[PDB]
Amino acid sequence: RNFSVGREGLEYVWGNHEPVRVWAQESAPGDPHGWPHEIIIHYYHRHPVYTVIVLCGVALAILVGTASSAACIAKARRDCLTPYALAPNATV
Amino acid sequence: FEHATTVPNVPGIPYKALVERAGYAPLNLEITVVSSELTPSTNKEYVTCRFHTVIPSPQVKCCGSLECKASSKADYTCRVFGGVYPFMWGGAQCFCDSENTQLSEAYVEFAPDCTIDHAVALKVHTAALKVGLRIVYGNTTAHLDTFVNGVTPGSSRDLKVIAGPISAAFSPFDHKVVIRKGLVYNYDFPEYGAMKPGAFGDIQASSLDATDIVARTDIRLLKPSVKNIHVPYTQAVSGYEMWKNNSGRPLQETAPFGCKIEVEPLRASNCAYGHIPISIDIPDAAFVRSSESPTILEVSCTVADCIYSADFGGSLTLQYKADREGHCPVHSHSTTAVLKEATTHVTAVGSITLHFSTSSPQANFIVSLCGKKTTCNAECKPPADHIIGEPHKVDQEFQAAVSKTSWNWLLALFGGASSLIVVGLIVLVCSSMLINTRR
């Protein structure tokens, strides 16, 4: 028989024996101190929902970092070029 | 000197705390809930068991008729039937072929075995919690039970210990509880006098030796059709049996938070749920002025590859210089780490091992020895033993669940993104400035 053991602990009682209580340890594959190659799998095992949330947070932050910084830079580049791009004889 | 702290309501787990009255040597304060007894305010509704169907010796007027009298017996169903002309071993037992009647008085009574096999329905208005605390303060300790109800001091001896309202008002017992042979089952038993045939409590009484027992077995009697005198009592099999068969597993195997359930009185015990607000006015005689305690003038922390785990999987060592040798307190200033020890005998110069446990993947928890502080720091490896027979000794604080390396990476990603939007702002500033500068 397989029983999922929560960090809170699980009690199993078999026949007439004294109830035995066991608790799940927060230990899983990978390593909290290896490279991300092992970090992400470790936290994902310990908490799938939290790990996926953090990963999407990173992805969203990266999206803002890239597309919003690129938009700002494009804005400044575009509006700094146009005073010259409109002039056919300006020495930039 | 009054002090207060929360304590995780987890039986046997020893909480640690350090009270640091300003002018006096920091005093070790370890709180341990050696036991708990969540005993609710029970009230007996009624007892019940297998009814015994007793059909009293039938009455026959022979040539005549009979008044179907009333009775106090439960489910008295003394219907009367005519034209029976019954037979006993001696043959016919009357003197007419008709114009005769049989009265078949019938009762339900407590079976003699009910004396032990009875069950009782208990209501539970509220589950007040009482916890048997064992507390050690300084080089002294006492055992005392207190009601975690709230203001209720429930203190004992010199320690005016006072518990606080349970963070969560959890109760394992449903509003209607039935007890059987010391097993407990939550079940919405029908109210007193509201018996229903074949349901639990089809028969009910004040107590086993009461004469006010009632019932609603749905007993009905057919005509005594066969030649021999017999009463055709028929009824729903006792609701006690149906409940005994279908009640499922008892509460002792279904209450959450690991509650253990006992009887006489009905009480939940050693149940690990929420936190216990605790405040204690430990007596000044327990303290000593800081100047008279041993004091360490140099200290550093070194950790021997702490295996973070539910038990004391980590180990660390303190190296120190002290002014005088003596016995001196130690404590963790972070609730993510708990020290197995609370006090040590300190040499003039030397070191001592301090076993510890932690739920954090790191060791970035400060350790205090008699008021000094040292930032311990190291990566703690996860434990190979996926399962242990000991309750997780510390809570999994999210604020310390991220490892230093992982926290570094996560803050590096957010730092990159934030710095990029900062550069965005900077270039918008540059463009706005250039537009006006080169007008």
B253 contacts chain A (CB < 8 A) = yes
Beta pairing partners, B121:
B46, B178
CA-based nearest residue to A42, from A33, B43, A12:
A33
Query: What kind of experiment solved this structure?
Result: cryo-EM
User: Which amino acid does the sequence have at B167?
Assistant: S
Residue position matching structure tokens 């400035």: B433
Tokens of B153: 């001091």
Nearest by CB: B361 against A32, A71, A76: A32
Instruction: Write phi, then psi, for B364 (nearest 5 degrees).
Output: -80, 50
The encoded tokens of residue B426 equal 């900077």
Range 334-393 of B in CB contact (< 8 A) with A = 359, 361, 379-392
**Distance in angstroms (rounded) separating the CA atoms of residues A68 and B67:** 99
Tell me the resolution in Å: 4.0
- In terms of DSSP bridges, do strands A20-24 and B387-388 run parallel, antiparallel, or are they unpaired? antiparallel
Q: Distance between CA atoms of B250 and B180, rounded to whole angstroms? A: 10
The residue with tokens 């489910």 is B75
CA B130 – CA B26 distance, rounded (Å): 30
| Domain spanning B296-379: CATH 2.40.30.170 | no
B57 Cβ partners below 8 Å, 6+ apart? none
Neighbour count for residue B350 (Cβ, 10 Å): 12
CA B46, chain centre distance (Å): 25
Chain B neighbors of A62, CB-CB under 8 A: 413, 416-417
Burial of B289 (0-12, 13-18, 19+ CB in 10 A): exposed
Neighbours of B246 (CB within 10 A): 8
Two structure tokens written together for B379: 């990566």
Contact: B421, A68; criterion CB under 8 Å? yes
Reduce the DSSP state of residue B411 to 3 states and report it. Answer: helix
Annotate B209-266 with DSSP letters as a single string.
T-S--EE----EE----SSB----EE-PPPHHHHHHHHS-S-GGGT-STT-EEETTTT
Q: How far is CA B402 from the centre of its chain?
A: 31
Strand locations in A2-52 (E): 10-12, 20-24
Q: Enter the tokens of residue B305.
A: 């590859």
A23 in Cβ contact with B380 (< 8 Å): no
Do B103 and B66 contact (CB within 8 A), yes or no?
Answer: yes
User: Which chain A positions have a beta carbon within 8 Å of B427's beta carbon?
Assistant: 72-73, 75-76
Beta bridge partners of B317: B302, B353
Taking the C-alpha atoms of residue B181 and residue B177, their distance in angstroms, rounded to an integer, is: 13
**Three-state secondary structure call for residue B373:** strand
| Residue among A9, A13, A20 minimizing CB distance to B392 | A9
Nearest to A7 by CA among B221, B18, B272: B272
Burial B190-226, CB ≥16 within 10 A → b, else e: beeeebebbbbbbbbbeeeeeeebbbbbebebeebee
- Tokens at residue B294, please? 């041993």
Per-position DSSP letters for B14-45, written without gaps between them: EEEEEE--TTB--EEEEEEEEEEEE---EEEE
Record: contact B409-A75, CB cut-off 8 A:
no
Determine the residue among B396, B406, B407 to mutate to test chain A binding: the one whose Cβ has the most chain A Cβ atoms within 10 Å. B406
DSSP assignment letter at B190: P
In angstroms, the CA B348 to CA A82 distance is: 78
DSSP three-state, residue A10: strand
On whether the CB atoms of residues B4 and B279 are closer than 8 A, the answer is yes
Q: How far apart are CA B230 and CA B189, in angstroms?
A: 35
Strand-strand pairing, B260-262 and B267-269: antiparallel
Q: Is B438 on the interface with A (CB under 8 A)?
A: yes
Both tokens assigned to B188: 């919405």
User: For the residues of B353-364, what is the DSSP string, one character each?
Assistant: EEEEEESSSB--
B28: which 2 tokens?
């070790």
The H or E element spanning position A30 is none
Q: Take residue B300 and report the two structure tokens written for it.
A: 């550093």
CA gap B384, B177 in Å, rounded: 43
User: Element (H or E) spanning A76, and its range?
Assistant: helix A69-85
* Beta pairing partners, B296: B322
Whether the Cβ atoms of residue B82 and residue B65 lie closer than 8 Å to each other: yes
Q: Which two tokens stand for residue A48?
A: 């799938």
Whether A68 contacts chain B with CB within 8 A: yes
Quote the CA–CA distance of A16 and B165 in Å, as a whole number: 37
Q: What are phi and psi of B304, to 5 degrees?
A: -95, 80
Write the burial class of residue B42 (CB in 10 Å: 0-12 exposed, 13-18 middle, 19+ buried): middle
Interchain contact, A64 vs B421, CB within 8 Å: yes
